[PDB]
Amino acid sequence: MTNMKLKFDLLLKSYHLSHRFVYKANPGNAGDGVIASATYDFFERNALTYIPYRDGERYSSETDILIFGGGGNLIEGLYSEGHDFIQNNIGKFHKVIIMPSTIRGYSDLFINNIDKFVVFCRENITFDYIKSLNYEPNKNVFITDDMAFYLDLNKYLSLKPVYKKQANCFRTDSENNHDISLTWNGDYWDNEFLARNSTRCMINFLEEYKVVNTDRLHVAILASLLGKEVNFYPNSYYKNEAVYNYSLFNRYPKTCFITA
Amino acid sequence: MTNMKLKFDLLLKSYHLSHRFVYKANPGNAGDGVIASATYDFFERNALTYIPYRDGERYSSETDILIFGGGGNLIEGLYSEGHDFIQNNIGKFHKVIIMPSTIRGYSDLFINNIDKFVVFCRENITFDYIKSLNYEPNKNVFITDDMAFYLDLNKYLSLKPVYKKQANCFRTDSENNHDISLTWNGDYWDNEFLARNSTRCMINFLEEYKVVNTDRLHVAILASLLGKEVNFYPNSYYKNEAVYNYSLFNRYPKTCFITA
Protein backbone atom coordinates (compact mmCIF):
# COMPACT_ATOMS: atom_id res chain seq x y z
CA MET A 1 0.00 0.00 0.00
CA THR A 2 1.40 3.36 -1.10
CA ASN A 3 1.80 6.18 1.40
CA MET A 4 -0.67 8.40 -0.47
CA LYS A 5 -3.19 5.56 -0.60
CA LEU A 6 -3.07 4.81 3.14
CA LYS A 7 -3.32 8.53 3.88
CA PHE A 8 -6.40 8.69 1.63
CA ASP A 9 -8.25 5.89 3.44
CA LEU A 10 -7.65 7.23 6.96
CA LEU A 11 -8.50 10.78 5.87
CA LEU A 12 -11.90 9.96 4.39
CA LYS A 13 -12.67 7.68 7.33
CA SER A 14 -11.84 10.62 9.61
CA TYR A 15 -14.35 12.85 7.81
CA HIS A 16 -16.96 10.07 7.98
CA LEU A 17 -16.90 10.10 11.79
CA SER A 18 -17.84 13.80 11.85
CA HIS A 19 -20.18 14.29 8.87
CA ARG A 20 -22.35 12.22 6.57
CA PHE A 21 -21.39 11.90 2.91
CA VAL A 22 -23.60 13.21 0.11
CA TYR A 23 -22.06 11.82 -3.07
CA LYS A 24 -22.38 13.13 -6.63
CA ALA A 25 -20.69 10.99 -9.27
CA ASN A 26 -18.90 12.91 -11.99
CA PRO A 27 -20.85 12.75 -15.28
CA GLY A 28 -19.07 11.98 -18.52
CA ASN A 29 -18.02 9.13 -20.77
CA ALA A 30 -17.24 5.53 -19.82
CA GLY A 31 -13.89 6.65 -18.42
CA ASP A 32 -15.91 8.53 -15.81
CA GLY A 33 -17.82 5.32 -15.15
CA VAL A 34 -14.50 3.69 -14.25
CA ILE A 35 -13.83 6.43 -11.68
CA ALA A 36 -17.27 5.83 -10.17
CA SER A 37 -16.85 2.04 -10.08
CA ALA A 38 -13.54 2.45 -8.24
CA THR A 39 -15.11 5.01 -5.90
CA TYR A 40 -17.87 2.54 -5.02
CA ASP A 41 -15.20 -0.11 -4.42
CA PHE A 42 -13.39 2.40 -2.20
CA PHE A 43 -16.50 3.18 -0.13
CA GLU A 44 -17.35 -0.49 0.40
CA ARG A 45 -13.80 -1.49 1.34
CA ASN A 46 -13.57 1.28 3.97
CA ALA A 47 -17.12 0.79 5.33
CA LEU A 48 -17.96 4.34 4.18
CA THR A 49 -21.71 4.82 3.89
CA TYR A 50 -23.11 7.62 1.75
CA ILE A 51 -26.38 9.01 0.45
CA PRO A 52 -26.62 9.87 -3.26
CA TYR A 53 -27.10 13.53 -4.12
CA ARG A 54 -30.75 14.26 -4.90
CA ASP A 55 -31.59 17.59 -6.51
CA GLY A 56 -34.20 19.45 -4.47
CA GLU A 57 -33.48 17.64 -1.21
CA ARG A 58 -32.56 19.70 1.84
CA TYR A 59 -29.10 19.08 3.29
CA SER A 60 -27.50 20.40 6.47
CA SER A 61 -25.10 23.33 6.03
CA GLU A 62 -23.35 22.16 9.22
CA THR A 63 -23.20 18.34 9.21
CA ASP A 64 -23.40 17.30 5.52
CA ILE A 65 -20.34 17.12 3.27
CA LEU A 66 -20.68 16.97 -0.51
CA ILE A 67 -18.36 14.36 -2.01
CA PHE A 68 -17.85 15.47 -5.61
CA GLY A 69 -16.65 12.53 -7.68
CA GLY A 70 -13.23 12.61 -9.26
CA GLY A 71 -12.50 13.36 -12.88
CA GLY A 72 -11.30 16.05 -15.22
CA ASN A 73 -14.43 18.11 -15.81
CA LEU A 74 -13.20 21.23 -13.95
CA ILE A 75 -11.31 22.65 -16.93
CA GLU A 76 -12.03 26.31 -17.69
CA GLY A 77 -12.50 26.91 -21.39
CA LEU A 78 -13.52 23.26 -21.91
CA TYR A 79 -16.33 22.08 -19.59
CA SER A 80 -18.59 24.05 -17.26
CA GLU A 81 -20.96 21.35 -15.96
CA GLY A 82 -18.94 20.43 -12.87
CA HIS A 83 -18.16 24.09 -12.17
CA ASP A 84 -21.85 25.03 -12.29
CA PHE A 85 -22.86 22.10 -10.07
CA ILE A 86 -20.39 23.02 -7.34
CA GLN A 87 -21.08 26.76 -7.43
CA ASN A 88 -24.86 26.29 -7.26
CA ASN A 89 -24.65 23.75 -4.41
CA ILE A 90 -21.62 24.89 -2.36
CA GLY A 91 -23.88 26.77 0.07
CA LYS A 92 -25.90 23.68 1.00
CA PHE A 93 -23.05 21.77 2.66
CA HIS A 94 -20.52 22.23 5.45
CA LYS A 95 -17.63 21.23 3.16
CA VAL A 96 -17.13 20.17 -0.45
CA ILE A 97 -14.61 17.36 -0.94
CA ILE A 98 -13.32 17.11 -4.50
CA MET A 99 -12.19 13.52 -5.09
CA PRO A 100 -8.87 13.06 -6.99
CA SER A 101 -9.24 15.40 -9.95
CA THR A 102 -7.49 17.27 -12.74
CA ILE A 103 -8.29 20.99 -12.47
CA ARG A 104 -7.38 23.76 -14.92
CA GLY A 105 -8.28 27.38 -14.38
CA TYR A 106 -11.42 28.42 -12.51
CA SER A 107 -9.15 30.36 -10.16
CA ASP A 108 -12.06 32.55 -9.00
CA LEU A 109 -13.96 29.47 -7.80
CA PHE A 110 -11.14 28.12 -5.62
CA ILE A 111 -9.91 31.43 -4.20
CA ASN A 112 -13.38 32.53 -3.08
CA ASN A 113 -14.35 29.13 -1.60
CA ILE A 114 -11.05 28.24 0.10
CA ASP A 115 -12.79 27.84 3.47
CA LYS A 116 -15.16 25.12 2.21
CA PHE A 117 -13.07 23.20 -0.36
CA VAL A 118 -11.00 20.11 0.36
CA VAL A 119 -9.25 19.36 -2.94
CA PHE A 120 -7.69 16.04 -3.90
CA CYS A 121 -5.39 16.30 -6.93
CA ARG A 122 -4.56 13.31 -9.13
CA GLU A 123 -1.31 14.75 -10.53
CA ASN A 124 1.42 17.28 -9.78
CA ILE A 125 0.22 20.06 -12.10
CA THR A 126 -3.15 20.33 -10.36
CA PHE A 127 -1.51 20.00 -6.94
CA ASP A 128 0.96 22.83 -7.56
CA TYR A 129 -1.81 24.97 -9.06
CA ILE A 130 -4.21 24.62 -6.12
CA LYS A 131 -1.45 25.08 -3.55
CA SER A 132 -0.35 28.20 -5.44
CA LEU A 133 -3.83 29.61 -4.68
CA ASN A 134 -2.76 29.59 -0.99
CA TYR A 135 -4.31 26.20 -0.26
CA GLU A 136 -2.49 24.44 2.57
CA PRO A 137 -1.00 21.02 1.74
CA ASN A 138 -2.24 18.20 4.00
CA LYS A 139 -5.10 20.37 5.31
CA ASN A 140 -7.33 21.39 2.39
CA VAL A 141 -5.28 20.24 -0.62
CA PHE A 142 -3.85 16.74 -1.14
CA ILE A 143 -2.29 14.71 -3.95
CA THR A 144 -2.99 11.04 -4.65
CA ASP A 145 -3.70 8.64 -7.49
CA ASP A 146 -6.80 8.83 -9.66
CA MET A 147 -9.58 6.74 -8.12
CA ALA A 148 -9.35 4.10 -10.86
CA PHE A 149 -6.15 2.77 -9.30
CA TYR A 150 -8.44 1.70 -6.41
CA LEU A 151 -10.44 -0.55 -8.76
CA ASP A 152 -11.05 -4.01 -7.25
CA LEU A 153 -9.93 -5.47 -10.55
CA ASN A 154 -10.57 -9.18 -10.00
CA LYS A 155 -14.37 -8.83 -9.85
CA TYR A 156 -14.42 -7.17 -13.30
CA LEU A 157 -12.24 -9.66 -15.20
CA SER A 158 -13.59 -12.14 -17.72
CA LEU A 159 -10.26 -14.05 -17.89
CA LYS A 160 -10.79 -14.51 -21.62
CA PRO A 161 -7.48 -15.34 -23.34
CA VAL A 162 -5.43 -12.91 -25.40
CA TYR A 163 -5.68 -13.56 -29.12
CA LYS A 164 -5.50 -10.15 -30.87
CA LYS A 165 -2.44 -7.99 -31.49
CA GLN A 166 -3.22 -4.25 -31.35
CA ALA A 167 -6.24 -2.27 -30.15
CA ASN A 168 -6.67 1.35 -31.24
CA CYS A 169 -8.79 3.41 -28.81
CA PHE A 170 -8.52 7.04 -29.93
CA ARG A 171 -10.78 10.04 -29.49
CA THR A 172 -13.16 10.19 -32.46
CA ASP A 173 -12.92 13.99 -32.81
CA SER A 174 -9.30 14.31 -33.97
CA GLU A 175 -7.45 2.53 -38.63
CA ASN A 176 -9.48 -0.06 -36.72
CA ASN A 177 -10.42 2.48 -34.06
CA HIS A 178 -12.69 1.57 -31.13
CA ASP A 179 -13.42 4.64 -28.97
CA ILE A 180 -14.76 2.52 -26.13
CA SER A 181 -14.85 5.57 -23.85
CA LEU A 182 -17.71 7.01 -25.93
CA THR A 183 -20.00 4.01 -25.35
CA TRP A 184 -21.99 5.20 -22.33
CA ASN A 185 -21.73 8.99 -22.12
CA GLY A 186 -23.80 11.13 -19.76
CA ASP A 187 -24.97 11.54 -16.17
CA TYR A 188 -25.30 7.81 -15.55
CA TRP A 189 -22.67 7.05 -12.96
CA ASP A 190 -24.73 7.51 -9.78
CA ASN A 191 -25.96 3.95 -10.51
CA GLU A 192 -23.25 1.66 -9.14
CA PHE A 193 -24.44 -1.33 -11.18
CA LEU A 194 -24.40 0.61 -14.45
CA ALA A 195 -20.95 2.00 -13.59
CA ARG A 196 -19.49 -1.40 -12.76
CA ASN A 197 -21.02 -3.19 -15.75
CA SER A 198 -19.94 -0.46 -18.16
CA THR A 199 -16.46 -0.87 -16.69
CA ARG A 200 -16.68 -4.63 -17.21
CA CYS A 201 -17.46 -3.96 -20.88
CA MET A 202 -14.34 -1.83 -21.37
CA ILE A 203 -12.23 -4.36 -19.49
CA ASN A 204 -13.73 -7.29 -21.44
CA PHE A 205 -12.76 -5.53 -24.67
CA LEU A 206 -9.18 -4.85 -23.59
CA GLU A 207 -8.49 -8.26 -22.02
CA GLU A 208 -8.30 -9.93 -25.45
CA TYR A 209 -5.53 -7.66 -26.81
CA LYS A 210 -1.78 -7.71 -26.24
CA VAL A 211 -1.08 -4.07 -27.18
CA VAL A 212 -3.31 -1.03 -26.57
CA ASN A 213 -2.80 2.33 -28.30
CA THR A 214 -4.82 5.19 -26.85
CA ASP A 215 -5.14 8.88 -26.01
CA ARG A 216 -7.94 8.07 -23.54
CA LEU A 217 -6.75 8.31 -19.94
CA HIS A 218 -8.85 5.58 -18.39
CA VAL A 219 -8.34 3.21 -21.30
CA ALA A 220 -4.63 3.65 -20.60
CA ILE A 221 -5.23 3.17 -16.87
CA LEU A 222 -7.38 0.05 -17.35
CA ALA A 223 -4.89 -1.50 -19.76
CA SER A 224 -2.08 -0.66 -17.31
CA LEU A 225 -3.96 -2.44 -14.52
CA LEU A 226 -4.30 -5.40 -16.91
CA GLY A 227 -0.53 -5.52 -17.39
CA LYS A 228 -0.86 -4.79 -21.10
CA GLU A 229 1.68 -3.16 -23.38
CA VAL A 230 0.28 0.37 -23.57
CA ASN A 231 1.17 3.23 -25.93
CA PHE A 232 -0.34 6.36 -24.38
CA TYR A 233 -0.70 9.56 -26.44
CA PRO A 234 -1.11 13.16 -25.22
CA ASN A 235 -3.96 15.66 -25.40
CA SER A 236 -4.40 19.30 -24.40
CA TYR A 237 -3.98 20.97 -20.99
CA TYR A 238 -1.35 18.31 -20.11
CA LYS A 239 -4.24 16.12 -18.98
CA ASN A 240 -2.85 12.75 -20.05
CA GLU A 241 0.84 13.60 -19.57
CA ALA A 242 0.42 14.81 -15.98
CA VAL A 243 -1.40 11.66 -14.82
CA TYR A 244 1.20 9.52 -16.61
CA ASN A 245 4.14 11.22 -14.88
CA TYR A 246 2.56 10.89 -11.43
CA SER A 247 0.90 7.46 -11.55
CA LEU A 248 2.00 5.38 -14.57
CA PHE A 249 5.72 6.15 -14.89
CA ASN A 250 7.91 3.38 -13.44
CA ARG A 251 4.97 1.90 -11.51
CA TYR A 252 3.77 0.29 -14.78
CA PRO A 253 6.89 -0.30 -16.89
CA LYS A 254 4.95 -1.71 -19.88
CA THR A 255 3.09 1.61 -20.33
CA CYS A 256 5.01 4.32 -22.16
CA PHE A 257 4.03 7.85 -23.18
CA ILE A 258 4.59 8.89 -26.81
CA THR A 259 5.38 12.60 -26.99
CA ALA A 260 6.06 12.71 -30.74
CA MET B 1 -42.95 -23.41 -22.20
CA THR B 2 -44.48 -22.35 -25.51
CA ASN B 3 -44.89 -24.86 -28.33
CA MET B 4 -42.53 -22.93 -30.62
CA LYS B 5 -39.94 -22.72 -27.84
CA LEU B 6 -39.93 -26.46 -27.09
CA LYS B 7 -39.76 -27.20 -30.82
CA PHE B 8 -36.76 -24.87 -31.06
CA ASP B 9 -34.78 -26.62 -28.31
CA LEU B 10 -35.32 -30.16 -29.63
CA LEU B 11 -34.59 -29.06 -33.20
CA LEU B 12 -31.21 -27.47 -32.49
CA LYS B 13 -30.30 -30.39 -30.22
CA SER B 14 -31.15 -32.69 -33.13
CA TYR B 15 -28.75 -30.83 -35.43
CA HIS B 16 -26.06 -30.93 -32.73
CA LEU B 17 -26.01 -34.73 -32.76
CA SER B 18 -25.18 -34.77 -36.48
CA HIS B 19 -22.94 -31.73 -37.03
CA ARG B 20 -20.78 -29.37 -35.02
CA PHE B 21 -21.83 -25.74 -34.68
CA VAL B 22 -19.73 -22.88 -36.05
CA TYR B 23 -21.32 -19.74 -34.62
CA LYS B 24 -21.13 -16.17 -35.95
CA ALA B 25 -22.84 -13.58 -33.76
CA ASN B 26 -24.76 -10.91 -35.63
CA PRO B 27 -22.90 -7.57 -35.52
CA GLY B 28 -24.74 -4.38 -34.70
CA ASN B 29 -25.78 -2.16 -31.83
CA ALA B 30 -26.43 -3.12 -28.21
CA GLY B 31 -29.77 -4.62 -29.24
CA ASP B 32 -27.73 -7.17 -31.17
CA GLY B 33 -25.72 -7.78 -28.01
CA VAL B 34 -28.96 -8.77 -26.29
CA ILE B 35 -29.63 -11.36 -29.01
CA ALA B 36 -26.14 -12.77 -28.51
CA SER B 37 -26.45 -12.86 -24.71
CA ALA B 38 -29.72 -14.80 -25.03
CA THR B 39 -28.15 -17.10 -27.62
CA TYR B 40 -25.30 -17.89 -25.23
CA ASP B 41 -27.88 -18.57 -22.51
CA PHE B 42 -29.70 -20.84 -24.97
CA PHE B 43 -26.56 -22.82 -25.83
CA GLU B 44 -25.59 -23.32 -22.18
CA ARG B 45 -29.08 -24.36 -21.08
CA ASN B 46 -29.32 -27.00 -23.85
CA ALA B 47 -25.72 -28.26 -23.46
CA LEU B 48 -25.01 -27.10 -27.03
CA THR B 49 -21.29 -26.70 -27.61
CA TYR B 50 -20.02 -24.53 -30.45
CA ILE B 51 -16.83 -23.14 -31.94
CA PRO B 52 -16.71 -19.42 -32.81
CA TYR B 53 -16.37 -18.55 -36.47
CA ARG B 54 -12.76 -17.67 -37.31
CA ASP B 55 -12.05 -16.04 -40.66
CA GLY B 56 -9.44 -18.01 -42.59
CA GLU B 57 -10.02 -21.29 -40.75
CA ARG B 58 -10.91 -24.37 -42.79
CA TYR B 59 -14.31 -25.92 -42.07
CA SER B 60 -15.86 -29.14 -43.35
CA SER B 61 -18.35 -28.77 -46.21
CA GLU B 62 -19.98 -32.01 -44.99
CA THR B 63 -20.02 -32.00 -41.16
CA ASP B 64 -19.90 -28.30 -40.14
CA ILE B 65 -23.02 -26.14 -39.88
CA LEU B 66 -22.78 -22.35 -39.73
CA ILE B 67 -25.06 -20.90 -37.06
CA PHE B 68 -25.70 -17.32 -38.16
CA GLY B 69 -26.87 -15.28 -35.19
CA GLY B 70 -30.34 -13.80 -35.17
CA GLY B 71 -31.19 -10.21 -35.90
CA GLY B 72 -32.53 -7.89 -38.56
CA ASN B 73 -29.48 -7.23 -40.71
CA LEU B 74 -30.74 -9.12 -43.79
CA ILE B 75 -32.75 -6.19 -45.16
CA GLU B 76 -32.15 -5.42 -48.84
CA GLY B 77 -31.80 -1.71 -49.45
CA LEU B 78 -30.70 -1.16 -45.84
CA TYR B 79 -27.79 -3.40 -44.73
CA SER B 80 -25.52 -5.67 -46.76
CA GLU B 81 -23.04 -6.90 -44.12
CA GLY B 82 -24.95 -10.04 -43.15
CA HIS B 83 -25.81 -10.77 -46.78
CA ASP B 84 -22.15 -10.55 -47.83
CA PHE B 85 -21.00 -12.73 -44.93
CA ILE B 86 -23.42 -15.54 -45.78
CA GLN B 87 -22.84 -15.43 -49.54
CA ASN B 88 -19.04 -15.49 -49.17
CA ASN B 89 -19.10 -18.34 -46.62
CA ILE B 90 -22.10 -20.48 -47.67
CA GLY B 91 -19.83 -22.85 -49.62
CA LYS B 92 -17.70 -23.71 -46.58
CA PHE B 93 -20.45 -25.45 -44.60
CA HIS B 94 -22.91 -28.31 -44.98
CA LYS B 95 -25.84 -26.10 -43.91
CA VAL B 96 -26.41 -22.51 -42.83
CA ILE B 97 -28.87 -22.09 -39.96
CA ILE B 98 -30.24 -18.56 -39.67
CA MET B 99 -31.29 -18.00 -36.05
CA PRO B 100 -34.65 -16.19 -35.50
CA SER B 101 -34.43 -13.23 -37.85
CA THR B 102 -36.30 -10.49 -39.67
CA ILE B 103 -35.59 -10.74 -43.41
CA ARG B 104 -36.65 -8.32 -46.15
CA GLY B 105 -35.84 -8.83 -49.80
CA TYR B 106 -32.67 -10.62 -50.92
CA SER B 107 -34.93 -13.03 -52.80
CA ASP B 108 -32.06 -14.11 -55.07
CA LEU B 109 -30.04 -15.26 -52.04
CA PHE B 110 -32.76 -17.51 -50.61
CA ILE B 111 -34.04 -18.97 -53.89
CA ASN B 112 -30.57 -19.99 -55.09
CA ASN B 113 -29.47 -21.44 -51.71
CA ILE B 114 -32.69 -23.23 -50.73
CA ASP B 115 -30.85 -26.56 -50.38
CA LYS B 116 -28.44 -25.22 -47.73
CA PHE B 117 -30.55 -22.71 -45.75
CA VAL B 118 -32.51 -23.48 -42.60
CA VAL B 119 -34.32 -20.24 -41.81
CA PHE B 120 -35.82 -19.31 -38.45
CA CYS B 121 -38.21 -16.35 -38.64
CA ARG B 122 -39.02 -14.17 -35.64
CA GLU B 123 -42.35 -12.86 -36.98
CA ASN B 124 -45.12 -13.69 -39.44
CA ILE B 125 -44.06 -11.34 -42.25
CA THR B 126 -40.65 -12.98 -42.61
CA PHE B 127 -42.19 -16.45 -42.23
CA ASP B 128 -44.75 -15.90 -44.99
CA TYR B 129 -42.08 -14.33 -47.21
CA ILE B 130 -39.59 -17.20 -46.93
CA LYS B 131 -42.29 -19.85 -47.30
CA SER B 132 -43.53 -18.00 -50.40
CA LEU B 133 -40.07 -18.66 -51.91
CA ASN B 134 -41.04 -22.38 -51.86
CA TYR B 135 -39.38 -23.06 -48.50
CA GLU B 136 -41.07 -25.93 -46.70
CA PRO B 137 -42.48 -25.14 -43.23
CA ASN B 138 -41.11 -27.37 -40.45
CA LYS B 139 -38.27 -28.60 -42.70
CA ASN B 140 -36.15 -25.62 -43.78
CA VAL B 141 -38.25 -22.66 -42.58
CA PHE B 142 -39.60 -22.18 -39.04
CA ILE B 143 -41.18 -19.41 -36.97
CA THR B 144 -40.40 -18.69 -33.32
CA ASP B 145 -39.70 -15.82 -30.94
CA ASP B 146 -36.67 -13.58 -31.22
CA MET B 147 -33.79 -15.03 -29.20
CA ALA B 148 -34.03 -12.30 -26.55
CA PHE B 149 -37.14 -13.95 -25.14
CA TYR B 150 -34.75 -16.77 -24.13
CA LEU B 151 -32.75 -14.36 -21.94
CA ASP B 152 -32.01 -15.85 -18.50
CA LEU B 153 -33.17 -12.58 -17.01
CA ASN B 154 -32.41 -13.10 -13.32
CA LYS B 155 -28.62 -13.15 -13.78
CA TYR B 156 -28.71 -9.70 -15.44
CA LEU B 157 -30.87 -7.86 -12.89
CA SER B 158 -29.53 -5.30 -10.45
CA LEU B 159 -32.80 -5.23 -8.44
CA LYS B 160 -32.37 -1.48 -8.00
CA PRO B 161 -35.70 0.16 -7.08
CA VAL B 162 -37.87 2.15 -9.45
CA TYR B 163 -37.71 5.88 -8.82
CA LYS B 164 -38.03 7.62 -12.22
CA LYS B 165 -41.16 8.15 -14.29
CA GLN B 166 -40.48 8.03 -18.05
CA ALA B 167 -37.49 6.91 -20.11
CA ASN B 168 -37.20 8.01 -23.75
CA CYS B 169 -35.06 5.63 -25.86
CA PHE B 170 -35.47 6.75 -29.48
CA ARG B 171 -33.28 6.36 -32.55
CA THR B 172 -30.98 9.39 -32.77
CA ASP B 173 -31.34 9.74 -36.56
CA SER B 174 -35.00 10.79 -36.78
CA GLU B 175 -36.65 15.42 -24.95
CA ASN B 176 -34.50 13.56 -22.41
CA ASN B 177 -33.56 10.92 -24.98
CA HIS B 178 -31.18 8.06 -24.14
CA ASP B 179 -30.47 5.92 -27.22
CA ILE B 180 -29.00 3.12 -25.14
CA SER B 181 -28.93 0.84 -28.19
CA LEU B 182 -26.17 3.00 -29.71
CA THR B 183 -23.78 2.48 -26.77
CA TRP B 184 -21.74 -0.48 -28.01
CA ASN B 185 -22.10 -0.71 -31.79
CA GLY B 186 -20.02 -3.01 -33.99
CA ASP B 187 -18.77 -6.56 -34.43
CA TYR B 188 -18.32 -7.17 -30.71
CA TRP B 189 -20.85 -9.83 -29.88
CA ASP B 190 -18.72 -12.96 -30.39
CA ASN B 191 -17.41 -12.19 -26.87
CA GLU B 192 -20.02 -13.63 -24.50
CA PHE B 193 -18.81 -11.55 -21.55
CA LEU B 194 -18.99 -8.29 -23.49
CA ALA B 195 -22.45 -9.24 -24.79
CA ARG B 196 -23.79 -10.11 -21.34
CA ASN B 197 -22.29 -7.08 -19.60
CA SER B 198 -23.52 -4.70 -22.30
CA THR B 199 -26.95 -6.26 -21.79
CA ARG B 200 -26.63 -5.74 -18.04
CA CYS B 201 -25.98 -2.04 -18.73
CA MET B 202 -29.16 -1.64 -20.78
CA ILE B 203 -31.15 -3.58 -18.19
CA ASN B 204 -29.62 -1.58 -15.30
CA PHE B 205 -30.74 1.61 -17.04
CA LEU B 206 -34.30 0.44 -17.62
CA GLU B 207 -34.85 -1.15 -14.18
CA GLU B 208 -35.09 2.28 -12.51
CA TYR B 209 -37.96 3.55 -14.71
CA LYS B 210 -41.69 2.88 -14.55
CA VAL B 211 -42.51 3.80 -18.17
CA VAL B 212 -40.36 3.25 -21.27
CA ASN B 213 -41.01 4.96 -24.62
CA THR B 214 -39.03 3.56 -27.53
CA ASP B 215 -38.79 2.73 -31.23
CA ARG B 216 -35.89 0.34 -30.50
CA LEU B 217 -36.99 -3.29 -30.70
CA HIS B 218 -34.77 -4.78 -28.03
CA VAL B 219 -35.30 -1.88 -25.65
CA ALA B 220 -39.00 -2.69 -25.98
CA ILE B 221 -38.28 -6.41 -25.51
CA LEU B 222 -36.06 -5.85 -22.46
CA ALA B 223 -38.57 -3.51 -20.84
CA SER B 224 -41.33 -6.04 -21.60
CA LEU B 225 -39.33 -8.78 -19.87
CA LEU B 226 -38.97 -6.38 -16.93
CA GLY B 227 -42.75 -6.00 -16.71
CA LYS B 228 -42.54 -2.28 -17.44
CA GLU B 229 -45.19 -0.07 -19.00
CA VAL B 230 -43.89 0.15 -22.57
CA ASN B 231 -44.93 2.48 -25.40
CA PHE B 232 -43.47 0.97 -28.58
CA TYR B 233 -43.25 3.03 -31.78
CA PRO B 234 -42.90 1.82 -35.40
CA ASN B 235 -40.14 2.08 -37.97
CA SER B 236 -39.77 1.08 -41.62
CA TYR B 237 -40.14 -2.34 -43.27
CA TYR B 238 -42.67 -3.28 -40.55
CA LYS B 239 -39.69 -4.34 -38.44
CA ASN B 240 -41.02 -3.30 -35.03
CA GLU B 241 -44.71 -3.88 -35.78
CA ALA B 242 -44.22 -7.47 -36.99
CA VAL B 243 -42.29 -8.56 -33.90
CA TYR B 244 -44.88 -6.85 -31.68
CA ASN B 245 -47.81 -8.65 -33.31
CA TYR B 246 -46.13 -12.06 -33.02
CA SER B 247 -44.38 -11.89 -29.63
CA LEU B 248 -45.50 -8.91 -27.53
CA PHE B 249 -49.25 -8.69 -28.20
CA ASN B 250 -51.33 -10.20 -25.37
CA ARG B 251 -48.29 -12.03 -23.97
CA TYR B 252 -47.14 -8.74 -22.39
CA PRO B 253 -50.29 -6.71 -21.72
CA LYS B 254 -48.41 -3.67 -20.36
CA THR B 255 -46.64 -3.17 -23.73
CA CYS B 256 -48.69 -1.39 -26.39
CA PHE B 257 -47.84 -0.35 -29.95
CA ILE B 258 -48.52 3.26 -30.96
CA THR B 259 -49.43 3.41 -34.66
CA ALA B 260 -50.21 7.14 -34.75
Side-chain angles (χ1 to χ4, degrees), chain A residues 32-53 55-151:
Chain A
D32 289 296
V34 180
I35 302 182
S37 307
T39 304
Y40 296 129
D41 296 353
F42 171 83
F43 289 157
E44 296 182 15
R45 196 246 295 178
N46 291 117
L48 299 174
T49 61
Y50 65 96
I51 60 165
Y53 174 87
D55 198 333
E57 219 190 67
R58 40 183 294 270
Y59 301 107
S60 173
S61 176
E62 186 184 22
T63 55
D64 286 348
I65 287 181
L66 172 71
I67 309 295
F68 187 67
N73 193 270
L74 298 180
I75 295 180
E76 184 170 14
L78 262 198
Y79 320 96
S80 60
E81 185 176 9
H83 166 273
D84 291 354
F85 181 85
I86 296 181
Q87 191 173 216
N88 296 332
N89 300 310
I90 181 95
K92 300 179 183 180
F93 302 92
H94 177 254
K95 296 292 184 183
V96 166
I97 297 180
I98 297 182
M99 298 296 272
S101 294
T102 286
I103 301 173
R104 300 290 185 265
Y106 290 137
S107 53
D108 184 23
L109 181 68
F110 291 94
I111 291 167
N112 282 323
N113 304 282
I114 189 169
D115 278 85
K116 313 196 71 176
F117 272 153
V118 180
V119 187
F120 290 88
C121 315
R122 66 183 186 183
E123 24 80 8
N124 273 313
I125 299 188
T126 295
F127 182 66
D128 293 343
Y129 166 49
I130 300 300
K131 86 179 185 178
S132 79
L133 304 180
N134 229 17
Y135 279 72
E136 175 156 355
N138 285 333
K139 176 165 186 169
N140 55 357
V141 61
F142 307 80
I143 182 166
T144 185
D145 287 317
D146 180 86
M147 292 303 296
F149 295 93
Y150 276 93
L151 192 70

Side-chain angles (χ1 to χ4, degrees), chain A residues 156-160 163 177-180 182-184 188 190-195 197-202 204-205 208, chain B residues 156-160 163 177-180 182-184 188 190-195 197-202 204-205 208:
Chain A
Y156 301 86
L157 302 178
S158 70
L159 300 188
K160 244 187 171 299
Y163 79 102
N177 191 42
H178 301 76
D179 196 7
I180 58 173
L182 282 190
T183 54
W184 284 85
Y188 300 110
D190 296 301
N191 181 317
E192 65 276 10
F193 289 89
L194 180 46
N197 285 321
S198 171
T199 303
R200 286 187 178 97
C201 287
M202 299 179 77
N204 291 339
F205 175 83
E208 291 183 300
Chain B
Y156 301 86
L157 302 178
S158 70
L159 300 188
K160 244 187 171 299
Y163 79 102
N177 191 42
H178 301 76
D179 196 7
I180 58 173
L182 282 190
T183 54
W184 284 85
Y188 300 110
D190 296 301
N191 181 317
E192 65 276 10
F193 289 89
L194 180 46
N197 285 321
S198 171
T199 303
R200 286 187 178 97
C201 287
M202 299 179 77
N204 291 339
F205 175 83
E208 291 183 300

Side-chain angles (χ1 to χ4, degrees), chain B residues 19 24 39 133 184 186 234 245 247:
Chain B
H19 312 86
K24 182 62 191 71
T39 304
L133 304 180
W184 284 85
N245 288 328
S247 295

